[PDB]
Design a protein around this ligand. Structure first.
Ligand SMILES: *Cc1c(COP(=O)(O)O)cnc(C)c1O
Length: 320
C-alpha cells in the first residue's frame, strides 16, 4: 500500500455491494456502486477533478492565476471546491439565494467565493451571473459540467473500468440516473466496448421524463432530471430509459438505510428502484445489474428525504 500525494489521488475506486433485503422478488442480481464513498461523498468528486485537471494539462489554466467559475447549486460545486482548495485555485460559485444555508457553508469552508443570485430567477439567474463574472474576470475559466467532455471522459477512464473489473466482467446491465449524463455516457461506452451485450439503462423522473417524450417539470429527485438533454449525454448508448417517481425514489432511499444500512441520497433511491424493477423481470433471471448510488444521504438532512423522520424527531420529548 502507499500514501496519497494529496486528496485528489483518493478519488475513485469506490466499492460495489450487493443489495439484499430490499431486492426481494428479484430473480436478477443488483450491486450498488457507492460513489457515496468518494472523499466528499458524491460522484461529482470525479468530474470536479477531471475538469480542472484536463484544463491544466491543456495549459488552459494555472494555480494562483486562473479563476475558476461555475454556476452550481449541487454536488458539482463541492467536487470542484475541495479539488480547488487542494490544487490552489481560486473558485467562484454562483447559486440561487434560495438554496439552504448548509449548501453555502460547505462551499465557504473550502474557501469558495460564493455569489448568490435572485431566488426568483432560479438556476437561469445563477448561470447569467456566472457568465457575467466570466466576462469581467481576466483569467476566468468556466467549467460547464453539462458541456465539458472531461465529464464523461473521467467515467470512461475510471468509473467504467472499476465496474468492469469489480464485477469480473459479469455485469449485464448498468443502471444510471441521468443528471449531466456523463456517468452513463462515459462508463457506458467503456462497458459497451468490453462486451457489446451489456445494456445501459438511463433513469429519469416520471415528473420530468424528457428522454421519453415527456415535458420538463418539477420533481424531488435531486441530482437527476435536468429538464433537458445535456450536451455531454449520448442518447445512442442508452438501451432503455426507466422512469421512477419522486415518491418511489424517496421510499427506496429510506428502505436502503433501514434494511441495508446504506444512508443514501434520493437519486440513489431512484437508481435502486429502477435496477430492482429490471432484476424482477423473469427474462433477467441470473443477470447482474450495477446501479450507481451518486451520493451519501447526510448532505440532504434538510430536504424532503428526511421530512418524515424529521417531524418525528422534533416531536419527541425526554423520558425521565
Ligand atoms: C451528478 C448527480 C447524478 C447524475 O450523474 P450524471 O453523471 O451527472 O449523469 C445523480 N445524483 C446526484 C446526487 C448527482 O450529484
Amino acid at each position: 500500500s502507499r500514501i496519497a500525494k494529496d486528496v485528489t489521488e483518493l478519488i475513485g475506486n469506490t466499492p460495489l455491494v450487493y443489495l439484499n433485503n430490499v431486492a426481494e422478488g428479484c430473480v436478477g442480481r443488483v450491486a450498488a456502486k457507492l460513489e457515496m464513498m468518494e472523499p466528499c461523498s458524491s460522484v461529482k468528486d470525479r468530474i470536479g477533478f477531471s475538469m480542472i485537471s484536463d484544463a491544466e494539462k491543456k495549459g488552459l489554466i494555472k494555480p494562483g492565476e486562473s479563476v475558476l467559475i461555475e454556476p452550481t447549486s449541487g454536488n458539482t460545486g463541492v467536487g470542484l471546491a475541495f479539488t480547488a482548495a487542494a490544487k490552489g485555485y481560486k473558485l467562484i460559485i454562483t447559486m440561487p439565494a434560495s438554496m439552504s444555508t448548509e449548501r453555502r457553508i460547505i462551499l465557504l469552508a473550502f474557501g469558495v467565493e460564493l455569489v448568490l443570485t435572485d431566488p426568483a430567477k432560479g438556476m437561469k439567474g445563477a448561470i447569467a451571473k456566472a457568465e457575467e463574472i466570466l466576462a469581467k474576470t481576466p483569467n476566468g475559466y468556466m467549467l460547464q459540467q453539462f458541456e465539458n467532455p472531461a465529464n464523461p471522459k473521467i467515467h470512461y477512464e475510471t468509473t467504467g473500468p472499476e465496474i468492469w473489473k469489480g464485477t469480473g466482467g459479469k455485469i449485464d446491465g448498468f443502471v444510471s440516473g441521468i443528471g449531466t449524463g456523463g456517468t452513463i455516457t462515459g462508463a457506458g461506452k467503456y462497458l459497451k466496448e468490453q462486451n457489446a451485450n451489456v445494456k445501459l439503462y438511463g433513469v429519469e423522473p416520471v415528473e420530468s421524463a424528457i428522454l421519453s417524450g415527456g415535458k420538463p417539470g418539477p420533481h424531488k429527485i435531486q441530482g437527476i432530471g435536468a429538464g433537458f438533454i445535456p450536451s455531454v449525454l449520448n442518447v445512442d448508448l442508452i438501451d432503455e430509459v426507466v422512469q421512477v417517481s419522486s415518491d418511489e425514489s424517496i421510499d427506496m432511499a429510506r428502505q436502503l438505510a433501514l434494511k441495508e444500512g446504506l444512508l443514501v441520497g434520493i437519486s440513489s433511491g431512484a437508481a435502486a428502484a429502477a435496477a430492482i424493477k429490471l432484476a424482477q423481470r423473469p427474462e433477467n433471471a441470473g443477470k447482474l445489474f450495477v446501479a450507481i448510488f451518486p451520493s451519501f444521504g447526510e448532505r440532504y438532512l434538510s430536504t424532503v428525504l428526511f421530512d418524515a423522520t424529521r417531524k418525528e424527531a422534533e416531536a419527541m420529548t425526554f423520558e425521565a
